[PDB]
């Protein structure tokens, strides 16, 4: 600490006094400032392209309910179920002929696929497919049942008529059926070339309609699910790259300011490699047992790891982004996360340069000194939260509605310790007030015991653990 | 305390130092650790069987609305009410003929019951039953009314036609009717042998449809309620016990690790029987008046009573669980509570072994020293909560909706002191702004006075009583 | 204070030590204990009678929508509005003939009224009544309009046919109409003699159906409102007073225990009349200027005024209650408040006898010493709450929905400072995002400024004002 | 401070002692008191006129759905969309003929416009207008597409028949269409002369109905939007200004009490001009460096700037208000804000005269001394709030519903840090549990990380920063 002190003096300056103590320009700092205004614009200019490309996937699904399902209304997609025998027939037949008579009745200008896949042959594109147990004979009240699990794949195909059948001959064997599925495809031309302002892309759907019976109980859920798939196409349209060469040059400007940002922040951390061996030569281990590496973690540059973490995930989006043009990758998911997560790390990086004004120093530093004592209390409670979910996850599983699945129960109790959807979870049990009247006696004790523990006893400590950390640090 | 001290020294060790001070293995401890991973799997492997067996009870009820009720739509089951004279007829007749013409129109493969019960004879299975006052003659505006309570059980039965009537002759006497009920049964074969992967069970319903009039006011609620009943049946199906003998052997492994857990925890408490008489021989009652038995309650092993409480309720489920196979008991309720409650006591048992790290010692111990002062404040408030329900329980009883029943009001105010369903309870009165305008003047003062008392005055003490207990114990 | 001290010593005893210091029995106390178990049963035994007598008023209103309104469905009673010209006709005509053809089509056994009132004559019971401006002639785009306010009461009556017309000749003058109303009555026999178990009462409705146009804007709200009126009737039914003489004798037992309760509590306060003049003779005003009468308010018996307030309102219900039998009063409102409010004052009277255990003494007494400082802060805020309602009450009046009326806005902001119906009040403006786009710019600043003031700045003082009162009183 | 002290002594008196130390009447004060009772009545007497004049704009929009849209029901205005080819036709044709056959079928007494505007000619008033790409030819699966953006304005007009066509010849070219719009107008006479009690105004609508397709995806949203426009008209009606000259004279009384209020409050601040130069002559800058102008901001009259701000905005409403009579301005928006904002500043002006009672002095002054330390903490958090919106604003943009637009996300998170609409935002993702299953893995971490930061860590400091300011100021 004779000559190390002035060498370590530069290692904990402010940004402001160091500029006057040495005289080197804050471009090493202010590149962080401009890349805020870079990447935020990069997100929103991605955001106009994404928000269009999902509504095209969305609206064509909403449309295909109102073409291929008899008597569909909006809203409930689960209550739509066929009960009678003939409504299973009529929903099938009303789904078949719309596929047959499509371009005379539809608006949207679609085209048939002429497939060759594995639930297809060559020539046909639609396929309805019965599924039932091969070897079996069941009867109640004179009880005998063979439930030999073996499908009977009766994929009775049908071709489309193109240009200006025996599916009527159909039986279903309702005592034995498992499910009836219907596969086909349609091609389309997406036509949302407003914000691109030029060349669009050319998409391909695949529609499944399922008359499922995994219940054998007299109710058949009727569903529609799609997947959209994308490829490229040949255009005669005119004057593409006008402002559209400018976005590509702009993404270079995006990848300009991040490129040198990786270099200097590593070079700033490279100084730590040059200082960590000098400290050990404090009179050539005259003490020696200072070294325990957690005190060296303060000697490690702290929040510089955050900026370099933001920077790697930043360039991983823009590299992935320019695959929108002529690469087979067009899944906008991984562009959304990587340009979504990296923007979250940029804005929190400015916090480090916010804590040098003294009335900003002493407030966020409370979160630094509390989080050791926070994490140690937190493991006491999180046993009990997890230990309390597994009771209601099967006990109040089917009887309730919002305690059905795996992760929704983990949402439901944690939503209930703040005060939203609390009374409705009380009220939904009371239709079972006499029906399974023992279980309502348990659920009423289940929710009364719970929030009396977390809200009225635990979270009061969770205030007083943070109130202390502000209290100790201001004196 | 000469030789007692080292004998009592072992009585408040940590688990860790005792292993090195004597040298006996922590299998006495770690059986608690593995039975976490036992019973939690036992719950979820019960959970796949239960969640299927209620949806079969659920979906067949949802189906039987859409067969036996004219013009039923989903959602509201209470607003469905017949007002005219003939809609009482048409709903009956549309309920009758579906029972007659069932297997030609339904999917689900049911069978008739050919009953012999007390609202039955032998031969018929359906019975509609008028109910009215025997001796009476009423007339408004020339006022005379005999309301002699005496049923007229006119159970006009009807048989089913099985294999490839005068209920039309029916009058109801609408000025005198009480209610019209309809009883029948149906058998079924549950066919959810996916997760069993082999042999299913064979069920039996009983359906009641009630055209109730306990109002005599021109509206007839129409309802449907079932009960499911289970027995066994003879199977030709093949290769049952493949992985299904393995679950039975697994339940022995469940009842393995709990069996010895009862033994050793009692033996640990058996040491207390060997130490409680030695302490009294502290120089042969040289003091004597130490003994007041609450100080002996700390000398009582504290949380060991919790594990033995968890263990007895654990084996009471698995014994009850193996009655799924070939015992007449099949009510999954008491298996759900006992494998539900015992799992809640397991996870909280680990808390005891969590409080020996010193920053875990001093946080949950606050709840120990506060709960005396908590319980004493709590009896002051809970008089007022109960003393405030009984006002609104009949005053705002019929005028409101969510203040109707007994226990829902106890839910409603306690939901209202946190902040869910608060504004809607204000808003529902304002349709009675002129109609009974005095009562809305009371309800507006009812809810304004209330949360100004509990939220703004009482619960602030309920924070400051717990904040103190953290404050005193950290110095 | 020589001989006054022992005389004032009895004036602040506990209840417990005074029983041993003098030896007089606690029947003076325990009558408060038993009247808890009296009046609470009196409320609930009133509650079975009230909850039936409103559902009869309720269900007959719900029924008369489904008879007299064309195409009514449940739920919305405001959106039901006739737009076309002929749907005003068809709803009238479908309301007329149901009144004509009632007993052949209805269940409920009603009877016609044969009225003689002021919008009636003798002979007819139904009356439809046009209302329009007498002297006027309006025309847009060649603009001239006389809006002389003068009704034209064209009450075209019609009689009913009783026992086994020219309303068709009707024009309405749609350019000039104000509203069309329809009056009639029906009698009934309430038949809910289950919990009385004997003699019922005989009721009378009056139904108004209004085709209002206070808008002249092309939409006519269609409404139905009733009033129920009660009188008595002659019965042939048998064995009335079996357990029904027992309730009358029970109400004497109710008015037994309250009667002497007024006497002794006044006599306890009568001691204060005997002590207030003795204190002034403290050495014959040797000081004199002690007397300022607020220190005498502690010398006033404090919570004894509460019991006597509960007692007067208690007997005012039971006196009012026995008018159910044979008095013209049958309005259950004032029985509901007076047996509702008096029960609230009984349970809070027990609190006084709860604060002598020392860990109960020092907790509710905080509310005593804080409420001076509470009320003084409270007048600072309640200016601002009232000063903030009047902005949104007309500015966000019609544009919103839940800021419409007078007192609902006073509900709405106070519901919004806790956290229910908060986001929906934000979201409802965004349909006016472009339509009146200036006003949404104001509402977004209206709700952002507000809860940032009360929740984040004011209510934090409202915790710290109560936390102090617990803090000062425990040292 | 020799003679300045008594001169500055008057500068910080109370209002009460100054009245006795000099003897000048508090009319200088009490004009603030009466203008509370002035302007509040002025708001509400404006409020009766405004609340009528928007319902006339409201109800005629609600009516025109039920005339011009086939099969419209109430509630959802977005789900109403035509899917088939002919339902686009039938909704157009059912919109056309109602415009043709209006006065025989409607109630409301409208009149046609006989327009001459830019999407009009002279003679016709209705115009339907196709819009499609001029030069283009598209085809999927043999891919070629020309998307040359050029409208084809085929506004096929049509006249009305007035007094007692070839739009049938119509094709739409569905493969090429952009949108179909329909313009017309209607005049009306508002007839809500109840609270004016005399002369009404004469209005003019303009209705647009849009069959938009900015999607080209097989769904056409169908919408209706209006704008109301007002002018004046000639009346024969009688006895106008009875109480209506009295309101005009009352607005002078409103502008009376505000007029002198500007004068004296400025004159009170004019004293500051007479005192600010005297203080500098404190022994002719014997110190001099006191002067830093923030200490002079306390020497600036503080809350007097608030009253003069309220007063200027007060007269700007009433001047704007009397343009209701005979000026072309009739937009009630700017009267609503200026009579809405100025009332908010009046009631908060009374607060200054509330803080001289000593238990009122020391409570609101906490907000004065905290707000420096509040604002400095607040800029640390508001970076993170804004830095966290931009992630979810495009990532959870289309996948969610309530994260769609720009400013609703800013509402949504801030609604979520208090506890309303919290669980529903969790639950809406789980329909995408398998569909884009990666993104739900991100949203579940998005909302778990968030409120664990603001609610459980940040806002606890936000209590402890205000609790301190009450704590320091009371000692
Ligand atoms: C979110 C944070 C805040 C804290 C301490 C108040 N807290 C709880 O209130 C209860 N709680 C769980 O039992 C839990 C388990 C798994 C995920 C999230 C949670 C969860 O919210 C908790 C507990 C464990 C881990 C994290 C937390
Ligand atoms: C749940 C616990 C928490 C505490 C103290 C805050 N608290 C209340 O806020 C009000 N309150 C009752 O009047 C009450 C009565 C019966 C069951 C549950 C409750 C109930 O929640 C209360 C009062 C009595 C007994 C338990 C409690
Ligand atoms: C209910 C009590 C609690 C307290 C102090 C927190 N508080 C408010 O938060 C705001 N507030 C009003 O401006 C107000 C005005 C009229 C009736 C009720 C209220 C009302 O709740 C308030 C203010 C004035 C009078 C009473 C109260
Ligand atoms: C309303 C006030 C209260 C305070 C401090 C608790 N607080 C927040 O909790 C979070 N927060 C924002 O990130 C934010 C950004 C823009 C407008 C409003 C807000 C906003 O409410 C905040 C933060 C920044 C500016 C004002 C505020």
3-state secondary structure D150-218: CCCCEEEEECCCCCCCCCCCCCCCCCCECEEEEEEEEEEECCCCCCCCCCCCEEEEEEEEEEECCCCCC
Ligand 1 neighbours by CB, cut-off 6 Å: A 378, 381-382, 385-386, 414, 417, 454, 462; D 452, 456
Alpha helical stretches, state H, C396-436: 407-416, 423-427
- Is D236 inside a domain boundary? no
Please, are residues A237 and D145 in contact by the beta-carbon 8 Å criterion?
Answer: yes
Please, are residues D188 and D202 in contact by the beta-carbon 8 Å criterion?
Answer: yes
In this complex, do A408 and D430 lie within 8 Å of one another by their Cβ atoms? yes
Shared domain check, D215 and D103: yes
| The total number of structural domains that make up chain A | 3
Shared domain check, A256 and A223: no
Rounded distance between C-alpha atoms, residue D84 and residue D78, angstroms: 17
**What is the b/e burial string over A372-398, where b = at least 16 CB atoms within 10 angstroms of the residue's CB?**
eebeebeebbeebbebbbbbbbbbbbb
Q: Which residues, in sequence order, are bridge partners of residue B50?
A: none
Please, are residues B208 and B226 in contact by the beta-carbon 8 Å criterion?
Answer: yes
Which of B83, B390, B468 shows the shortest C-beta gap to C43? B390
D417 CB neighbour count, 10 Å cutoff: 17
Backbone angles phi, psi at A247, to 5 degrees: -70, -40
As given in the structure block, the two tokens for residue B162 are: 């099985």
Rounded distance between C-alpha atoms, residue B361 and residue A91, angstroms: 65
Rounded distance between C-alpha atoms, residue B114 and residue B158, angstroms: 11
* End residue of a domain, out of C353, C384, C402: C353
Cβ within 8 Å of residue C211, ≥6 positions away: C82, C88, C91, C92, C179, C180, C181, C220, C221, C222
Task: Give CA torsion, residues B129, B132, B134, B136, to 10 deg.
Answer: -160
For residue D81, the SS3 value is strand
Please, are residues C349 and C444 in contact by the beta-carbon 8 Å criterion?
Answer: no
Rounded distance between C-alpha atoms, residue C132 and residue C174, angstroms: 9
The three-state (H, E, C) secondary structure of C223-267, written as one string: EEEEEEEEECCCCCCCCCCCCHHHHHHHHHHHHHHHHHHHHHHHH
As given in the structure block, the two tokens for residue C94 are: 């479908």
Nearest ligand (C-alpha, residue D450)? 1
To one decimal place, what's the resolution in Å? 3.7
Rounded distance between C-alpha atoms, residue D470 and residue B266, angstroms: 55
As given in the structure block, the two tokens for residue D216 are: 């080209």
Q: Which of C371, C377, C384, C385 to mutate to test the pocket of ligand 3 (most atoms within 8 A of CB)?
A: C385
Shared domain check, D205 and D92: yes
HSE-CB for D135 with a 13 A CA cutoff: 4
> Partners for D (CB, 8 Å, 3+ pairs)?
A, B, C
**What is the b/e burial string over B460-473, where b = at least 16 CB atoms within 10 angstroms of the residue's CB?**
bbbbbbbbbbbeee
Q: Which atom of ligand 4 is nearest the CA belonging to D381?
A: 23
Rounded distance between C-alpha atoms, residue B205 and residue B227, angstroms: 6
Q: DSSP letters along B296-339, please?
A: HHHHS-STHHHHHHHHHHHHHHHHHHTHHHHSS---SHHHHHHH
- Is A58 inside a domain boundary? no
As given in the structure block, the two tokens for residue A262 are: 């990786």
Please, are residues B9 and B284 in contact by the beta-carbon 8 Å criterion?
Answer: no
Shared domain check, A279 and A367: no
* End residue of a domain, out of A212, A231, A250: A231
B37 CB neighbour count, 10 Å cutoff: 10
For residue A235, the SS3 value is coil
Strands (E), C47-94: 81-82
- Is C250 inside a domain boundary? no
The residue assigned the tokens 């329809």 is: C182
Nearest ligand (C-alpha, residue B466)? 2
Shared domain check, B198 and B179: yes
Identify the helix (H) or strand (E) that includes residue B116.
Answer: none
Rounded distance between C-alpha atoms, residue C342 and residue C307, angstroms: 9
Ligand 4 centre distance from Cα of residue D385 (Å): 7
Cβ within 8 Å of residue C294, ≥6 positions away: none
The three-state (H, E, C) secondary structure of C16-30, written as one string: HHHHHHCCCCCHHHH
Rounded distance between C-alpha atoms, residue C217 and residue D296, angstroms: 61
Identify the helix (H) or strand (E) that includes residue D405.
Answer: none
For residue B462, the SS3 value is helix
Shared domain check, D156 and D31: no
Shared domain check, C105 and C15: no
Q: Closest Cα partner for B442 from C414, C309, C334, C305?
A: C334
In this complex, do C333 and B380 lie within 8 Å of one another by their Cβ atoms? no
C461 ligand 3 Cβ < 6 A: no
Rounded distance between C-alpha atoms, residue C13 and residue C280, angstroms: 22
Q: Which residues, in sequence order, are bridge partners of residue B139?
A: B144
Nearest ligand (C-alpha, residue C377)? 3
Shared domain check, B453 and B379: yes
In this complex, do D192 and C175 lie within 8 Å of one another by their Cβ atoms? no
Please, are residues D186 and D161 in contact by the beta-carbon 8 Å criterion?
Answer: no
Ligand 2 neighbours by CB, cut-off 6 Å: A 452, 456; B 378, 381-382, 385-386, 414, 417, 454, 462
Q: Which residues, in sequence order, are bridge partners of residue B127?
A: B157, B183
A411 CB neighbour count, 10 Å cutoff: 22
As given in the structure block, the two tokens for residue A340 are: 């979504």
Name the method of structure determination.
Answer: cryo-EM
**What is the b/e burial string over B128-138, where b = at least 16 CB atoms within 10 angstroms of the residue's CB?**
bbbbbbeebeb
- Is B56 inside a domain boundary? no
In this complex, do B442 and C337 lie within 8 Å of one another by their Cβ atoms? yes
Quick one: closest CA in D to A40, which residue? D390
In this complex, do A435 and B225 lie within 8 Å of one another by their Cβ atoms? yes
Alpha helical stretches, state H, B201-294: 244-275
Alpha-carbon distance B463 to nearest alpha carbon in chain D (angstroms): 13
Residue length of chain D: 475
* End residue of a domain, out of D353, D378, D396: D353
Q: Domain of C301?
A: 4-50+255-353
Judged on CB neighbours under 10 Å (0-12, 13-18, 19+), A339 is: buried
- Is B17 inside a domain boundary? yes
Please, are residues C53 and C195 in contact by the beta-carbon 8 Å criterion?
Answer: no
- Classify the phi-psi angles of A435: left when phi > 0, otherwise alpha if psi is within -120 to 50, otherwise beta: beta
Q: Closest Cα partner for A152 from A135, A138, A165, A137?
A: A135
Rounded distance between C-alpha atoms, residue D307 and residue D304, angstroms: 5
Q: Work out the angle between the directed axes of helices B244-275 and B304-321 (0-180°, nearest 10).
A: 150
Please, are residues D299 and D272 in contact by the beta-carbon 8 Å criterion?
Answer: yes
Alpha-carbon distance A150 to nearest alpha carbon in chain D (angstroms): 27
Question: What sign does the dihedral D227-D232-D234-D236 (CA atoms) show?
Answer: positive
Judged on CB neighbours under 10 Å (0-12, 13-18, 19+), A237 is: middle
In this complex, do C456 and D462 lie within 8 Å of one another by their Cβ atoms? yes
Please, are residues B39 and B343 in contact by the beta-carbon 8 Å criterion?
Answer: yes
The Cα-based distances of D443 to A1, A343, D400, D436 in angstroms read 50, 16, 10, 11
In this complex, do B43 and A465 lie within 8 Å of one another by their Cβ atoms? no
Rounded distance between C-alpha atoms, residue D296 and residue C370, angstroms: 38
In this complex, do D192 and C215 lie within 8 Å of one another by their Cβ atoms? yes
Alpha helical stretches, state H, D209-332: 244-275, 295-299, 304-321, 323-326
Please, are residues C56 and C192 in contact by the beta-carbon 8 Å criterion?
Answer: yes
Please, are residues B187 and A140 in contact by the beta-carbon 8 Å criterion?
Answer: yes
Q: Closest Cα partner for D55 from B434, C440, C397, C434?
A: C397
Q: Which residues, in sequence order, are bridge partners of residue B202?
A: B189, B231
D457 ligand 4 Cβ < 6 A: no
The residue assigned the tokens 């990296």 is: A342
Shared domain check, C345 and C307: yes
Identify the helix (H) or strand (E) that includes residue B127.
Answer: strand B126-130
Cβ within 8 Å of residue D467, ≥6 positions away: C460, C463, C464, C467
Rounded distance between C-alpha atoms, residue C83 and residue D67, angstroms: 8
Alpha-carbon distance A51 to nearest alpha carbon in chain C (angstroms): 19
Rg, chain B, Cα only: 32
Number of helices (H), then strands (E), belonging to chain A: the values are 15, 6
- Is B52 inside a domain boundary? no
Rounded distance between C-alpha atoms, residue A333 and residue A228, angstroms: 13
Ligand 3 centre distance from Cα of residue C384 (Å): 9
Q: Closest Cα partner for A108 from D151, D222, D174?
A: D174
Rounded distance between C-alpha atoms, residue C319 and residue C254, angstroms: 11
- Is A442 inside a domain boundary? yes
Q: DSSP letters along A342-390, please?
A: HHHHHHGGGGTTTTTSHHHHHHHHHHHHHHHHHHHHHHHHHHHHHHHHH
Shared domain check, A214 and A275: no
Rounded distance between C-alpha atoms, residue B165 and residue C379, angstroms: 79
Q: Closest Cα partner for A443 from A427, A457, A429?
A: A429
Shared domain check, C270 and C182: no
Shared domain check, D467 and D367: yes
Q: Which residues, in sequence order, are bridge partners of residue B206?
A: B185, B227
| Percentage helix, strand, coil for chain B under 3-state DSSP, each rounded to 5 | 55, 10, 35
Backbone angles phi, psi at B154, to 5 degrees: -100, 65
Identify the helix (H) or strand (E) that includes residue B87.
Answer: helix B86-100
Ligand 2 centre distance from Cα of residue B360 (Å): 29
- Is D260 inside a domain boundary? yes
As given in the structure block, the two tokens for residue A430 are: 């009371």
Please, are residues D417 and C421 in contact by the beta-carbon 8 Å criterion?
Answer: no
Rounded distance between C-alpha atoms, residue D308 and residue C7, angstroms: 64
> Which chain A residues are closer than 8 Å to D219 by Cβ?
59-60, 62-63
């Amino acid at each position: 600490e004779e000559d190390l002190r002035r060498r370590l003096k530069y290692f904990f300056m402010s940004p402001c006094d160091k500029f006057r103590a040495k005289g080197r320009k804050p471009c090493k700092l202010m590149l962080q400032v401009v890349k805020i205004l870079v990447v935020t614009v990069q997100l929103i200019l991605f955001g106009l392209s994404n928000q269009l490309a999902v509504t095209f996937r969305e609206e064509n699904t909403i449309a295909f309910r109102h073409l291929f399902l008899l008597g569909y209304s909006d809203g409930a997609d689960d209550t739509f179920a066929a009960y009678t025998r003939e409504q299973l027939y009529q929903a099938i037949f009303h789904a078949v002929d719309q596929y047959l008579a499509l371009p005379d009745v539809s608006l949207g200008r679609y085209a048939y696929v002429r497939g060759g896949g594995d639930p297809w042959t060559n020539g046909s594109g639609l396929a309805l497919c019965q599924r039932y147990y091969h070897r079996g004979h069941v009867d109640p009240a004179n009880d005998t049942f063979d439930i030999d699990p073996m499908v009977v794949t009766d994929c009775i195909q049908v071709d489309p008529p193109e240009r200006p059948s025996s599916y009527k001959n159909l039986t279903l064997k309702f005592h034995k059926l498992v499910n009836v599925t219907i596969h086909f495809r349609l091609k389309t031309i997406n036509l949302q070339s407003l914000i691109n302002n030029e060349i669009p892309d050319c998409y391909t759907f695949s529609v499944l309609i399922t008359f499922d019976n995994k219940a054998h109980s007299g109710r058949i859920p009727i569903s529609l699910e799609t997947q959209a798939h994308i490829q490229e196409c040949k255009h005669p349209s005119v004057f593409q790259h006008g402002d559209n060469s400018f976005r590509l040059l702009f993404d270079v400007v995006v990848i300009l300011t991040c490129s040198l940002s990786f270099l200097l922040c590593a070079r700033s951390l490279l100084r730590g490699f040059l200082l960590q061996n000098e400290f050990v030569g404090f009179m050539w281990r005259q003490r020696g047992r200072v070294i325990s590496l957690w005190e060296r973690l303060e000697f490690v540059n702290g929040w510089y790891i955050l900026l370099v973490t933001s920077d790697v995930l930043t360039i991983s989006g823009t590299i992935m982004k320019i695959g929108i043009e002529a690469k087979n990758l067009a899944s906008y998911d991984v562009c959304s996360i990587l340009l979504g997560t990296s923007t979250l790390l940029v804005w929190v990086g400015v916090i480090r340069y916010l804590t040098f004004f003294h009335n900003y120093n002493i407030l966020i530093a409370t979160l630094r000194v509390a989080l050791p004592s926070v994490m140690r209390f937190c493991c006491c409670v999180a046993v009990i939260y997890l230990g309390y979910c597994f009771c209601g996850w099967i006990v109040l599983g089917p009887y309730h509605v919002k305690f059905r699945s795996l992760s929704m129960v983990s949402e439901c109790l944690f939503s209930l310790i703040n005060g939203d959807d609390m009374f409705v979870t009380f009220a939904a049990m009371q239709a079972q007030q006499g029906r399974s009247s023992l279980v309502w006696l348990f659920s009423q004790l289940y929710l009364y015991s719970f929030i009396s523990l977390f809200i009225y006893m635990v979270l009061s400590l969770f205030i007083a653990l943070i109130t202390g950390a502000y209290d100790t640090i201001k004196h």
